[PDB]
């Protein structure tokens, strides 16, 4: 003798902002599921991000190119924010080549099949000289969480090329998660509640897949609990 929650309509207000609803939730499980999901989403969602960059005419992060106004370090800082969706491979090499005066935005990346540039207007640099030309190759990996350069330095693995520029990896697409349990008038019941989870992401992970994966992880840990050895 129980009820059980069914995934219902998933409204999309913007590309980044989303509302997901769960209608038939038993009394008391509203807050439990809300909080559990919030934790799993904020903590464990896998994403892809740039790990290191090689630009041609630059020895180290602190030098400067002719005809650009940003420092190289600020260029890395801009790349850290680049939101990209990789489908098949784990490590992709994107190529950016632009010349002439203008703002080098993310759209100018060489269009590959498997990679989706979510925000093509996102700026990267500004050229300021007719003959100034920038070429670069950005290596993008898949991962979970937050990994800084300095920890990965232990596993250098022949970092010998001085042209390599390491970037801290924020392997996480979800920026914000909130949930509300509000009275769910079901046609034959008195006191039932519906959970509405509104989530804001960088526009890479789709809501359905996020929620499914989170529920998967929590269910897996519960599976670990079901059996008890006592041996």
């Amino acid at each position: 003798e129980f009820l059980k929650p069914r995934l219902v309509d998933i409204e999309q207000v913007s590309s980044t902002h989303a509302k997901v609803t769960l209608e038939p939730l038993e009394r008391g499980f509203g807050h439990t599921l809300g909080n559990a999901l919030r934790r799993i989403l904020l903590s464990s969602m896998p994403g892809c991000a740039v790990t290191e960059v090689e630009i041609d005419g630059v020895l180290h992060e602190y030098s400067t190119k002719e005809g650009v106004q940003e420092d190289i370090l600020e260029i890395l800082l801009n790349l850290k924010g680049l939101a990209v969706r990789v489908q098949g491979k784990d490590e992709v090499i994107l190529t950016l080549n632009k010349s002439g005066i203008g703002p080098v935005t993310a759209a100018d990346i060489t269009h590959d099949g498997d990679v989706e540039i979510v925000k093509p207007q996102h700026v990267i640099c500004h050229l300021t000289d007719e003959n100034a030309s920038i070429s670069m190759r950005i290596k993008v990996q898949r991962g979970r969480g937050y990994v800084p350069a300095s920890t990965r330095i232990h596993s250098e693995e022949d970092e010998r090329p001085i042209g390599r520029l390491l970037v801290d990896a924020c392997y996480s697409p979800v920026e914000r998660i909130a949930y509300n349990v509000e009275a769910a008038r079901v046609e034959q019941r008195t006191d039932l509640d519906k959970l509405v989870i509104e989530m804001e992401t960088n526009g890479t992970i789709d809501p359905e897949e996020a929620i499914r994966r989170a529920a998967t992880i929590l269910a897996e840990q519960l599976e670990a609990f079901v059996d008890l050895r006592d041996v």
């Binding site: 934790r39 903590s43 602190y62 300095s150 914000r176 909130a178 804001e200």
Partner: protein, 49 residues
């Protein structure tokens, strides 16, 4: 002295537990722990402090 060679090293230092932080009004402190985002309090809207 025949000649001299000077070399500059540059090092990027990130904040870590034990460093000293202060305000403008005389309040001080040592950073004691770095918490995950989820543990921190959040207002209804979901923004953590």
């Amino acid at each position: 002295v025949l000649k001299i060679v000077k070399v500059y090293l540059a090092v990027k230092r990130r904040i870590q537990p034990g460093d000293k932080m202060a305000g403008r009004h005389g309040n001080k402190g040592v950073i004691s722990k770095i918490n995950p985002i989820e543990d921190m309090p959040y207002d209804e809207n979901g923004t953590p402090v």
